[PDB]
Every structure is written in C-alpha cells, then in structure tokens.
Design a binder for this molecule. Structure first.
Ligand SMILES: C[C@@H]1CCCCn2ncc(-c3nc(Nc4ccc(N5CCN(C)CC5)cn4)ncc3F)c21
Length: 263
C-alpha cells in the first residue's frame, strides 16, 4: 500500500483513524481514515475535495482519496483535549485563548460560508499543530453530548448555529480546562445548560419538540463569571452570544470574527 499504518489515534462512529507513513512523500506522518460501503457519499466527498482547493489554514489538509474508501489527511501531532491536559498551571495564557478562538472562528466561518455544518464540534476534533495552529477535522462526512446545541438536543434545527453553541463550550473550557455542561443524557444535558444560561422565553422554545419548556425548572439565568473564571468583560459578551438558546438570535461565526474581543 502507498501508506503504512503505525498506530491508531482515533475510533468512533466517524470511522477508524490511523497514524501512518506517507511512503511516497518522504515518510511524513499522515492520518488515514476508512469509510464503509451509495451516491450521498459521492456528494460529501466532492465537497471535501472542493474545500481543499482553498487550502484553508484552519482545516486539516486532504492529501489523497482512495478506493472501501480511504481518506488521507495531514497528521497534526496532538488534539485540543491533550493540549489542555499537558498545558502548565495555572492554565492557558489569556491571549493564547484569544488567538486559538480566532483560528477556530475562521475555520468555522470558512466551513459555514461554503454551507458546511460540522455538527459535532468538540475538543477531540480540534487539532493543534506543533506551531500552535488550530486545524479542524472530522467534518463534511456522515457519544458525547457535552457540546451539543440545545436545538439538537430538543431535535428541531440542525443548522450552522449548532456549531456556534459548541464554540461556546470550547471557549469556556479554555478557561476551565474542564467541560462546562457535562450531562449523561440529552435530557440531562439540556438541564445542565438551562441551569446556567437560564430558562428562555416561551417563543424561544421550538415547536413540535417532545420536550416542552415547562418540563424544566431552572429558575434563574446565572452569571457566567461564576462557572467560568478569568474571563474579561469582552470574553463574557462574546461567550454569552455563542451560548444563546434561540439559534436565530445566536451569533454567527462571521459576526463573531468582527467582535471587540479580537482587537
Ligand atoms: C483521530 C483524530 C481525532 C478524533 C476525530 C477523528 N479525526 N479525524 C481526523 C483526525 C486527525 N487527527 C490527527 N492527529 C491526532 C489526533 C488525535 C491524537 N490522539 C492520540 C490518542 N490520544 C489518546 C489523544 C490524542 C493524535 N493525533 N491528525 C490529523 C487528523 F486528520 C482525527
């Protein structure tokens, strides 16, 4: 084979990911991934090869596609979840957050501008280069609920604001170094959320969902500076807009890039 697997670096419902040697391209480490045995896959692959034509610095580069189906990416040495583990005390520098957040919002904005929703944005998909660059992975191709948007939990909409709620949970985890909303089910996840952001208005609750608003009793909207520590006045306003219950009122990645927090 053109690539030689050396170690497993990821497993799940997306497929099995391997660290491999690019035997033909200088022995560089690459990320292999195999998908199962269709025409909807033809669709999602052409999109992946189309976004590659742009070669965005905040998305993992696609080196090859083979034939059930093998996907070769640029190997980046570690992910966000092992970066936050190994980072020294007392945490991530305040500007290292601001920079990584901007790279995150740029990759998401690139993905959203081309009408691609990540749908599972979490630290395990966020990768950090040895240089410190944020490169997104595991998208454009079809369990932890800790980063699901409220509208995915309620099962109503699954649009681009879904990824911006996750950005809020990652934003707060870059000050906590621990997940903000950590639930054991979708009904518990939505509860741990509303316990902090507050019970929204009756018109903010989507319709035809099985879970009614009156199901929860999270009486107050709590101040976010209690659950997240060390966030500035701007880091609060930006984080509050990502963690907005109504996806229509929630901030977009394009509007988040042009926010006072990134000056
Ligand atoms: C498998 C990942 C992430 C999941 C989601 C699936 N997906 N998709 C792409 C990648 C990916 N990952 C890396 N590198 C990486 C990732 C994790 C790790 N890990 C090794 C095991 N450790 C316990 C944690 C760190 C090491 N290199 N480099 C390029 C990539 F395109 C991954």
């Amino acid at each position: 084979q053109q690539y030689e697997c050396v170690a497993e670096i990821g497993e799940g419902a997306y497929g099995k990911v391997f660290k491999a040697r690019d035997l033909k391209n200088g022995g560089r480490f690459v990320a292999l991934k195999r998908v199962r045995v269709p025409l909807s896959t033809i669709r999602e692959v052409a999109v992946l090869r189309h976004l590659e034509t742009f070669e965005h610095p905040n998305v993992v580069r696609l080196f090859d596609v083979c034939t059930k189906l093998t996907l070769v990416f640029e190997h980046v040495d570690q992910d966000l979840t092992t970066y936050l583990d190994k980072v020294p005390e007392p945490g991530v520098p305040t500007e290292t957050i601001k920079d990584m957040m901007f790279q995150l919002l740029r990759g998401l904005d690139f993905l959203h501008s081309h009408r691609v929703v990540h749908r599972d944005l979490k630290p395990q998909n966020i990768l950090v280069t040895s240089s410190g660059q944020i490169k997104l992975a595991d998208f454009g191709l079809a369990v932890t609920l800790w980063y699901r948007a409220p509208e995915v939990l309620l099962q109503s909409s699954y649009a681009t604001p879904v990824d911006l709620w996750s950005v809020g949970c990652i934003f707060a985890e870059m000050f906590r170094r621990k997940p903000l909303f950590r639930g054991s089910s979708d009904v518990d996840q939505l509860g741990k959320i509303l316990d902090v952001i507050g019970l929204p208005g009756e018109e903010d609750w989507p319709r035809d969902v099985a879970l009614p608003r009156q199901a929860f009793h999270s009486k107050s909207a709590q101040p976010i500076e209690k659950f997240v520590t060390d966030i500035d006045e701007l880091g609060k306003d930006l984080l509050l807009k990502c963690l907005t219950f109504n996806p229509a009122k929630r901030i977009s990645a394009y509007s988040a890039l042009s926010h006072p927090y990134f000056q």
